[PDB]
Design a protein around this ligand. Structure first.
Ligand SMILES: Nc1ncnc2c1ncn2[C@H]1C[C@H](O)[C@@H](COP(O)(O)=S)O1
Ligand SMILES: *[C@@H]1O[C@H](CO)[C@@H](O)[C@H](O)[C@H]1NC(C)=O
Ligand SMILES: *[C@@H]1O[C@H](CO)[C@@H](O)[C@H](O)[C@H]1NC(C)=O
Ligand SMILES: [Zn+2]
Ligand SMILES: [Zn+2]
Ligand SMILES: [Zn+2]
Length: 267
């Protein structure tokens, strides 16, 4: 996601974590504000364009070597790659927080976890094709951009009605209410199925596999001829909106569950 998506995911997680988890995170971050997770949710997307953080560029993705929209699937060993991926990063940074939450690596580990659980839910962060669709130029609202960019940024900002932190917060609140009482309120009971703090790879692969299915069902189900030739801010946006909204909701809810587990400090 772009910044709005990440911040929204983070605010959703803040609505579901336990008070002790809240303290656990605020103390690591040095941030006692009511935006403590949202404030650090975009940090990894800066870090990756620094000399020191450049190594972490691949940690945003797992490049599923599938064939959408006919066939989707993601596999850890096939797809992660030798430079690491979202899944291997979740394992590493989770384990740092399990082993040494008060150590000097914990701050960045937590910033990564908040960010990367977000990214695992963006279907095109879970797809190899044309660099996650970055290579697929498209028209959106009369302007040239690319398919990746509209999923990260244009469509979520359009749905949220902007891009400020306060807009992310409002959006998060809308989605959080959908989880508590609204359209996701039955489904969500099964959103943490399979979660296992002792098996971060399996846990995050469930999430990524779930998200990757939408590459076939929604992102590319119209086919590339349609995608390459049609302004995607019309019916394509309309079809995409319920999907990215549910995925952002899943990401926030799962992020909260995972933070609760981390803060519980299992031996
Ligand atoms: N799934 C992906 N696999 C590989 N590279 C990707 C993927 N998604 C996007 N990219 C590339 C496109 C850009 O060069 C770069 C940064 O894209 P972002 O910052 O919009 S996430 O990563
Ligand atoms: C995190 O990853 C690094 C680099 O691969 C590795 O050396 C280290 O053992 C890992 N740390 C944890 C806590 O798993
Ligand atoms: C759509 O455009 C991409 C390049 O962005 C190209 O790889 C693909 O073949 C095109 N497909 C069609 C059907 O036009
Ligand atoms: Zn992102
Ligand atoms: Zn992206
Ligand atoms: Zn990212």
């Amino acid at each position: 996601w772009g910044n709005l998506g990440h911040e929204t995911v983070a605010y959703i997680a803040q609505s579901f974590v336990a008070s002790s988890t809240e303290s656990f995170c605020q103390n690591i971050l040095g941030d006692d504000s009511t935006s403590y997770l949202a404030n650090v949710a975009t940090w990894a997307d800066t870090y990756k364009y620094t000399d020191a953080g450049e190594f972490s560029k691949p940690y945003h993705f797992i490049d599923a070597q599938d064939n959408p929209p006919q066939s989707c699937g993601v596999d850890y060993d096939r797809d992660c790659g030798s430079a690491g991926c979202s899944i291997s990063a979740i394992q590493n940074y989770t384990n740092i927080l399990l082993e040494s939450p008060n150590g000097s690596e914990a701050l960045n580990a937590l910033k990564f976890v908040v960010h990367i659980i977000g990214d695992i839910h963006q279907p095109l962060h879970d797809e190899n094709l044309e660099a996650g669709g970055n290579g697929i130029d498209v028209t959106y609202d009369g302007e040239t951009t690319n398919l990746h960019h509209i999923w990260d940024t244009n469509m979520p900002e359009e749905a949220a009605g902007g891009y400020s932190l306060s807009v992310a917060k409002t959006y998060a609140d809308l989605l959080t209410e959908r989880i508590k009482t609204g359209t996701y309120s039955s489904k969500k009971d099964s959103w943490t199925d399979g979660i296992d703090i002792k098996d971060p790879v399996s846990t995050s692969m469930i999430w990524a596999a779930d998200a990757n299915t939408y590459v076939c069902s929604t992102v590319l189900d119209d086919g590339l001829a349609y995608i390459n030739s049609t302004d995607l801010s019309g019916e394509y946006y309309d079809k995409s909106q319920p999907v990215f909204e549910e995925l952002i909701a899943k990401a926030g809810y799962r992020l909260a569950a995972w933070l609760d587990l981390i803060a519980s400090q299992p031996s």
